[PDB]
Design a protein around this nucleic acid. Sequence first.
RNA 1: UGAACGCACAUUGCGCCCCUUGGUAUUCCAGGGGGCAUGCCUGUUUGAGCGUCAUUU
RNA 2: ACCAUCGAAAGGGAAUCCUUCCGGAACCUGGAUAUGGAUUCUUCACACUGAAUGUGGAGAAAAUCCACAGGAAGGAAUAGUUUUCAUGCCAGGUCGUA
Lengths: 87, 199, 158, 290, 112
Amino acid sequence: RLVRKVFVSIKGVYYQANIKGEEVRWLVPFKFPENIPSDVDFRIMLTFLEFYSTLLHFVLYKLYTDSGLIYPPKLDLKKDKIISGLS
Amino acid sequence: LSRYVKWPEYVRVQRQKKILSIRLKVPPTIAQFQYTLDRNTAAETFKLFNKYRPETAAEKKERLTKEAAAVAEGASPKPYAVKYGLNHVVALIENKKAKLVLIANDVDPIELVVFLPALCKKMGVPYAIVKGKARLGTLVNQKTSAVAALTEVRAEDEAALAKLVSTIDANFADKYDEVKKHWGGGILGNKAQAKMDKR
Amino acid sequence: YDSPVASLFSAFVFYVSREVPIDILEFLILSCGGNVISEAAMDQIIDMSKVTHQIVDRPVLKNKVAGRTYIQPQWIFDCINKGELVPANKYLPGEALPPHLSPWGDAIGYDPTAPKKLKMIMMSNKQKKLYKKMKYSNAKKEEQAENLKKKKKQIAKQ
Amino acid sequence: LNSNPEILLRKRRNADRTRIERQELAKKKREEQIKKKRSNKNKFVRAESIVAKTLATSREKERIKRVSILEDKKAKNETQHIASGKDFILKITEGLIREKTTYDGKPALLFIVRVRGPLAVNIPNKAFKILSLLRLVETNTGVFVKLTKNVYPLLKVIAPYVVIGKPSLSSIRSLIQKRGRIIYKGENEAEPHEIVLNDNNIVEEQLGDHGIICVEDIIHEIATMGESFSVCNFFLQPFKLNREVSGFGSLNRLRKIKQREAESRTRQFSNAATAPVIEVDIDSLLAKLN
Amino acid sequence: ENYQYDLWGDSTETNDHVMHLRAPKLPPPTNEESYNPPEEYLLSPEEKEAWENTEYSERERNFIPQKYSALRKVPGYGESIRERFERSLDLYLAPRVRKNKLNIDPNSLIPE
RNA sequence: UGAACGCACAUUGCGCCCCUUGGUAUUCCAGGGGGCAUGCCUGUUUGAGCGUCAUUU
RNA sequence: ACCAUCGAAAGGGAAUCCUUCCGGAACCUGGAUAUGGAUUCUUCACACUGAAUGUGGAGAAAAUCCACAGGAAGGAAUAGUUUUCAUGCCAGGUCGUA
């Protein structure tokens, strides 16, 4: 229960949470089909994602273990087949 | 100026040898190696020969270790593969055991294989000159192989080998047996044919 | 817990309808202390016992059962930013929403919810240029604010 | 002078020109790929290709004729000299087990994915007609269908060209929310643009009369076969899926080898009149294809 | 066990070097970006065309504000991949400069 | 110093690479430590050559 | 596009005088930087940006210094670009020296 602020915009939804005394704001796009432009270079975005994924792996492990939770969390395959979200 | 510096010496010699290959009047025994199997016959020959490729080191080691592990706790048919190695294949030919012998046409010491078509014809063994010594090594798991041979074949492919032998007899032996024994390499260049053939 | 936002919706059970995106609303409700019974979750191969609210987005509702409170999604989006459970009268199915302002304000400080030249001679050249740049920046900010005010007044005319 | 330290990122140089150049390069690459693709239809045709096509198409045609005669015999309740009168369904699931169950009369929801058919086979008239009414001609493309007693004989004719199974709610939701297409009018004149479902305004404009005002209402009418199932099903148009392995480098070539090696065990076709309709786990496949 | 241990642990080490320049985050969204902004934020057709004709690197705002009467009416953003791509391009191609931004009022520069 | 090996040498001259330390120190200066010859062999990695080839399900 | 390196204490060569120490006074070279002014309505003046490329002068065979054609690129709203304009800071090893 760390969510502090929310803002629904035309680009997506901005969530601001309080992680260890820091304000963390991230944008989640709407769940709609995307139109991929041939202009962009995914060769760079893939490296950026490769770095960010490992950063989150370590940060999530630290956050889960500091709070006494078990990591990685067990996936409920029965509840994953209906909505497949955070729940 | 001096533009020769656009080619290193090894490239220049490498191309000079290529020119000398087609300008010189080569003897028939070395000339016969320019007559090789065509596209269809060579493509059909390597479909049969690729089904009897010998086991690699890793596969043979794995197969032997499985048997060893089975034995350590608590009647097979003869294998089939393509025969290679120059001495082994030559010994097979003169014993009349090889059913089909593929001879590479680009052996650098060409005298290693000059006697092979004659030995195969004299001993009544079907043979074919196949373009590429690096391609014979792929079905042998070596970088290059001067020769390849088929001594025994699985009963499923006995008809295919006979049909391939007949095809090579019709396409390669009976087709080139008159021009095989003629001196080759008398190709004339344009600057030379213009002044000799025309005049 | 340590913040009022983490205590909101504690004794609430929301019935999230099909129209509203469950992904961005169940997360917000659960992160405050609520419970979600999504309508989109009964399409695979409950019966709304303890539900106290319902988030709808249809132009017109059908059932309107007594007891429940019917709201539009923005209520949640406005109950978190204030953190004080704003009244649901302005968020009802079928009317116009309030303007949902950003938690981080306006770029130029404009508030939407609202009712020398003789001494410049002695300045050096670089000081005068810097002063003119600063005055131009301030004038542009004020002009951008006044344009928005004029547009608001024209809108409120009709 | 009352300053505040900060870090500043300078603007990138010549970004717009690079953007325009990349757009032009992408367009040129697409155009030249099309050029080379349609320029390769005039190449020499070897005899073996023609013979193989004839033989394989002759085998497939006999398969279809046998299946059609068997279904005609079962339809007229003339099941006296037929091999089998039961509508079997085979469920393949991965250590790979098979369930051979009799099909009910109960309608079901299926997601049919158009895969590449048998090699050296020209699609005969019956199978092509069935695939054309299903709007499944482009490979790597899927469609939602309602399985009933009359749809079942159709699935036995187009079996080698498709892979079938029952999707879950999460698969349906992710499929509609990631790959949604519509034939919608352009600016003023150009009709046949195939655009993505970005807003519910177009859905309300098109399907609003039936009561469908958002994408999530299409998801409801598809997940549960409703009265307006057909209207939205023929409104969504076939889904453009992603092929499993896409490439011809060494890593991708060996991925292709490993993927084909597993296809001999998952999509099995008996080439018989009484062949069961093969059903697989669509959730995992769509996890691969999404 | 990939990435299944504690990296930082209890350490409180700092990277405060003279040439460690950190990217200054990203400005927060404002009112005009909202899905239901006050009516005065919408652009006139003349302003819309002025924005449309401006170069992509010369635009003061990278979007046109829109007002939606409901949440279900909001469309998926179109230039969502491109914004992330531009941010990632700036993160390693844009030179980083230390600067002391001024914060005085203009009237202090006037001679007394 | 010498077969004598970073380059020269009738000079006790002139360089390059890596790590580290000290003085206002991201730029400057200095100190300390370790390296940089040729022919040949085996292997590793990176290449050149329209030299020989193969290349439609 | 074209070849290492050696070869001058009388050749070319940055700088000290009343030639090294002392006192006073002064230059040369290299480097990081700050201030003032200029770059005049906002964008390279009547100090005064200048890439590849091609030339000229001094040296006079080479080292070394400078300049010219050329038009690449860059420059503005809480410090725009340049700093051949002025001032301000630091340092200068080895060998010979009767």
